[PDB]
Design a protein around this ligand. Structure first.
Ligand code: QQZ
Length: 352
């Protein structure tokens, strides 16, 4: 029945949005299911398979959040610290009045989704943070942002003395059991890297950008993402450092109505209505700043999700610890976040 449920709910989306290829993974009671559809490459007629590498987009934030949780539990950082304590060069500039938790969770009060296009170099990055100056009451307003978690990410790599790409590929990925997850796809794996397809069905991949690795720059396979979901459902089986990191990412920090923000993960009381899952990615929540309130109801039974996108790829990831289930969907064309969320909802709810 798992296979038949995904065929009912995910398969039609390939035709509906002319998506070349898709990989849907389900984990239940420590049993993994992998469903593959279509092509990693239209021009090569190479099929999507277990070796196919997709761009995760903002699901990369979950790895950046896990890397921070690890660094905090090795004593390398505190989430009450300010960025200037590690990147000396910002060390009494006004960015050093925002703390790492506030960076991680988007409540600087003045960071947008993107850098400005003009910024590209390492010096242009450091200079934009040297010249960063306040706006909304720090800590009070959530606005989703690549530079913010991007800065948290870089600060985490500074506290670990290793550039960010190495923190993941030598430290975090091996600790999670991930064999084919990369910030940079090496030469021997380029044959498995899918093409993404833009809205003109042109084959494309992700463009270089400032602090792209920590905010949207991880590439993985379906087996690997199911391993990552496994880890989130069962952190007690992993090494102490990574287990503590994973638990750290599950703690709700504030609410923005029915969405609780954690470290990368969005958190909900379970069971959640569909529409509660949809509003987490409504334009209001994703693009416009919003004022945060303190957690009032600590949810008893929780569920977590995150969407991601580069211009050629779509990702969605969801897990419910207490039902011991989760789902990952990866596509090499963006479909609307709404459609990702709904199909997953029907598949998981139908398997109890
Ligand atoms: B993340 O995926 C952030 N997404 S984004 O909208 O900032 C974005 C989109 N596209 C790129 C890109 N394509 N090719 N080079 N770069 C980067 C960043 O969260 P979401 O799921 O989008 O809410």
């Amino acid at each position: 029945e798992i296979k038949k449920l995904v065929d009912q709910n995910f398969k039609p989306l390939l035709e509906k949005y002319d998506v070349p290829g898709m990989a849907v993974g389900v984990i239940q009671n420590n049993k993994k299911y992998e469903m593959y559809y279509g092509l990693q490459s239209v021009q090569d007629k190479k099929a999507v398979n277990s070796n196919t590498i997709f761009e995760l987009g903002s699901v990369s934030k979950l790895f950046t959040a896990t890397a921070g949780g690890y660094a905090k539990n090795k004593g390398k950082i505190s989430f009450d610290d300010t960025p200037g304590k590690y990147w000396k060069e910002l060390k009494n500039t006004p960015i050093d009045q925002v703390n790492l938790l506030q960076l991680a969770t988007y409540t600087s009060g003045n960071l947008a989704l993107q850098f400005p296009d003009e910024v590209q170099t390492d010096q242009q990055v450091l200079t934009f943070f040297k010249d960063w100056k306040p706006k909304n009451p720090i800590g009070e307003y959530r606005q989703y942002s690549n530079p913010s978690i991007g800065l948290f990410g870089k600060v985490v790599a500074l506290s670990m003395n290793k550039p960010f790409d190495q923190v993941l590929e030598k430290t975090i990925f091996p600790a999670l059991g991930l064999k084919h997850s990369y910030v940079n796809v090496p030469k021997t794996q380029m044959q498995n890297y899918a093409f993404g397809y833009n809205q003109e069905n042109q084959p494309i991949r992700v463009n270089p950008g400032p602090l792209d690795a920590p905010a949207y720059g991880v590439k993985s396979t379906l087996p690997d993402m199911l391993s990552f979901i496994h880890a989130n459902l069962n952190p007690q089986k992993y090494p102490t450092d990574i287990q503590r990191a994973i638990n750290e990412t599950h703690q709700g920090r504030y609410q923005v109505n029915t969405m609780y923000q954690a470290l990368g993960w969005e958190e909900f009381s379970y069971p959640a209505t569909l529409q509660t899952l949809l509003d987490s990615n409504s334009e209001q929540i994703v693009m416009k700043p919003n004022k945060v309130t303190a957690i009032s109801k600590e949810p008893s039974v929780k569920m977590y999700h995150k969407t991601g996108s580069t211009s050629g790829f779509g990702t969605y990831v969801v897990f419910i610890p207490k039902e011991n289930i989760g789902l990952v969907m990866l596509t090499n064309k963006r479909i609307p976040n709404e459609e990702r969320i709904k199909a997953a909802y029907v598949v998981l709810n139908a398997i109890k």
